[PDB]
C-alpha cells in the first residue's frame, strides 16, 4: 500500500507547545483543516497525565476524518482538571468552558507547575465564578461586568452583592496537586457537509516489483505484477485504463 | 433560612493569637463576602471588615491591620480568622455574617447569626 | 475617612408613644447604600431599613426610616416590649464602611 509523501502536517505543536495558555473564562480556541493530523504523535506520548477519548477510539482516531478541528486550550486548576468532561458540572463546566453531554473529541491535559506556576503566584489566569446562568456549550464568555448577586445595581463600584465574577488562580510551585496549574487542549472533531480535508497520516510500504501483490495506490485496489512501464503520462494524470475500462 | 456555625466558649491570655473558625450552611458560600463584628460586654461596637471568600480578599480597619488576619477553606466553606498581640482590656464576642440570601440570586440584607464566641481575658 | 455621629446616650421612652432617633455625617453620603439596624443588649444586630425606603425583611410594618442629604432618622409610632435595643447607622457602598454609633431605646 503507497501513499504520497506526509506533508502539510497539522499545527498541533504549536498549541501543547504554545508559550502562552489561555485563562479558563477565555480559552483560545483554534481551527485546524486540509492538514494532516500527527493524532498518533500525541498519542503515543507520555508527557500529557491525562488523555479521554469520547467518541473516537484514542488508538483508531487516526482513521477518522472530519471537517475541522477544533483545539480549545486553557490552563486550569488540577481539581479542575476532571471538570473539562462531557456532563461535567461545577464552575469551570459551567461558566468558564461548559462542553455538551455529546461531546466528540480529545481532551489532553498535562501539569504545567514547572511552567506556569510561579514563585509569586500566577495570576494571569482567571476563571468566571459568578454568572446569570450556566453557559452553553463551547460558549465563550469574558465579561468583566460586576455581578449582581442582588437586585441592588453595582454601578461599576464593588460592595454587597457586587462581586467580580473572574478569580484569578493562585499557582505557585510549592502549590499541591489539585492548585498546581495544568494545560489542557480539548480537540473537538466537527464533521459538517464537507469534503472533511483533515485526515491522519496514510501509511507507506516498501514497492515490489515482478511478483504477484496486492497494491492499494491511494483509491485504487487490485492484485497483480507491476513491472517498469514505457509509456508517458501527463502531469496530471494519476493512472491509465485500458479499451476495456480497466486499469 | 441559612444557619452560621462559630466557635463556643473562649477564655484566654494576654498576647496569645486567637484562632476563630466561622462556616455557613443553608445558601451558596461560594463567593459571598463575610463580614465580622466584635462587642465587649454591653459596650458599643465597631467595625472589624469583612473578607471576600471566593478570592480571599481581606479588608479591615485602619486600627486592625497587622494583628487580624484571616484564611480561606472551600472544602468546609469556612473563614479562619486570627488575632494578634490582645491586651488584657480586649475581654468580648465575636459575630460573624454572611449576606442572608437564598441562590445565585438572592437577596442583599445581613440578616441571620452565627452562634458567637466569647473571648474571655484575665490575668 | 468619613464619621459619623447618632443620636445621643441613654435615652428613655414611655412605651406606646412615638420615638425618633437621628444620624449625621460630616460628610455627604449615598442613601442607595445606607442602612438603619437594631442589636439587643447582648445579641447580635438585626437589620431594620435598608435604602431609607425598603423594609427589610423580618421586620414589622411599623418601624420606619428615612433622610436625605447627611441627615437620617428612624421612627417607631408604637413602642413594643422589643424596642429595648440600640440602633445603629450604616453606608455600605464603596471600601470606607462606617457601623452605627449607637443608640439605646430603652424601657421607663
Known amino acids: 500500500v503507497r501513499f504520497p509523501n506526509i506533508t502539510n502536517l497539522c499545527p498541533f505543536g504549536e498549541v501543547f507547545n504554545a508559550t502562552r495558555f489561555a485563562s479558563v473564562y477565555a480559552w483560545n480556541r483554534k481551527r485546524i483543516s486540509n492538514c494532516v493530523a500527527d493524532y498518533s504523535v500525541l498519542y503515543n506520548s507520555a508527557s500529557f497525565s491525562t488523555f479521554k477519548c469520547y467518541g473516537v477510539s484514542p488508538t483508531k482516531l487516526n482513521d477518522l476524518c472530519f471537517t475541522n478541528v477544533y483545539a480549545d486550550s486553557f490552563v486550569i486548576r488540577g481539581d479542575e482538571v476532571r471538570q473539562i468532561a462531557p456532563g461535567q458540572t461545577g464552575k469551570i463546566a459551567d461558566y468558564n468552558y461548559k462542553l455538551p453531554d455529546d461531546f466528540t473529541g480529545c481532551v489532553i491535559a498535562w501539569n504545567s507547575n514547572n511552567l506556569d506556576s510561579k514563585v509569586g503566584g500566577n495570576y494571569n489566569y482567571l476563571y468566571r465564578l459568578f454568572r446569570k446562568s450556566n453557559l452553553k456549550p463551547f460558549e465563550r464568555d469574558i465579561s468583566t461586568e460586576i455581578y449582581q448577586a442582588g437586585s441592588t445595581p453595582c454601578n461599576g463600584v464593588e460592595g454587597f452583592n457586587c462581586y467580580f465574577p473572574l478569580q484569578s488562580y493562585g499557582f505557585q510551585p510549592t502549590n499541591g496537586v489539585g492548585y498546581q496549574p495544568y494545560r489542557v487542549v480539548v480537540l473537538s472533531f466537527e464533521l459538517l457537509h464537507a469534503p472533511a480535508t483533515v485526515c491522519g497520516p496514510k501509511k507507506s510500504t516498501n514497492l515490489v516489483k515482478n511478483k504477484c501483490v496486492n497494491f492499494n495506490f491511494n483509491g485504487l485496489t487490485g492484485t497483480g505484477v507491476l513491472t517498469e512501464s514505457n509509456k508517458k503520462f501527463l502531469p496530471f494524470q494519476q493512472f491509465g485504463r485500458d479499451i476495456a475500462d480497466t486499469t | 433560612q441559612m444557619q452560621l456555625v462559630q466557635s463556643g466558649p473562649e477564655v484566654k491570655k494576654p498576647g496569645t493569637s486567637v484562632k476563630v473558625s466561622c462556616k455557613a450552611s443553608?445558601?451558596?458560600?461560594?463567593?459571598?463576602?463575610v463580614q465580622w463584628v466584635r462587642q465587649a460586654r454591653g459596650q458599643r461596637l465597631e467595625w472589624i471588615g469583612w473578607?471576600?471568600?471566593?478570592?480571599?480578599?481581606?479588608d479591615y480597619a485602619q486600627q486592625f491591620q497587622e494583628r487580624v488576619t484571616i484564611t480561606r477553606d472551600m472544602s468546609t466553606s469556612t473563614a479562619y480568622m486570627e488575632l494578634s498581640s490582645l491586651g488584657s482590656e480586649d475581654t468580648a464576642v465575636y459575630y460573624c455574617?454572611?449576606?442572608?440570601?437564598?441562590?445565585?440570586?438572592?437577596?442583599?440584607?445581613?440578616?441571620?447569626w452565627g452562634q458567637g464566641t466569647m473571648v474571655t481575658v484575665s490575668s | 475617612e468619613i464619621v459619623l455621629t447618632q443620636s445621643p446616650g441613654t435615652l428613655s421612652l414611655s412605651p406606646g408613644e412615638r420615638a425618633t432617633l437621628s444620624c449625621r455625617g460630616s460628610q455627604s453620603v449615598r442613601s442607595s447604600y445606607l442602612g438603619w439596624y437594631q442589636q439587643k443588649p447582648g445579641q447580635a444586630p438585626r437589620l431594620l431599613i435598608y435604602?431609607?425606603?425598603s423594609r427589610a425583611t423580618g421586620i414589622p410594618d411599623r418601624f420606619s426610616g428615612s433622610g436625605s442629604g447627611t441627615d437620617f432618622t428612624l421612627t417607631i409610632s408604637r413602642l413594643e416590649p422589643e424596642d429595648f435595643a440600640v440602633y445603629y447607622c450604616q453606608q455600605y457602598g464603596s471600601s470606607p464602611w462606617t457601623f452605627g454609633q449607637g443608640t439605646k431605646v430603652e424601657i421607663k
Open positions: 443553608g445558601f451558596t458560600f461560594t463567593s459571598s463576602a
Open positions: 455574617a454572611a449576606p442572608n440570601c437564598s441562590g445565585g440570586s438572592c437577596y442583599d440584607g445581613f440578616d441571620l
Open positions: 435604602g431609607a425606603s
Open positions: 473578607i471576600v471568600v471566593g478570592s480571599g480578599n481581606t
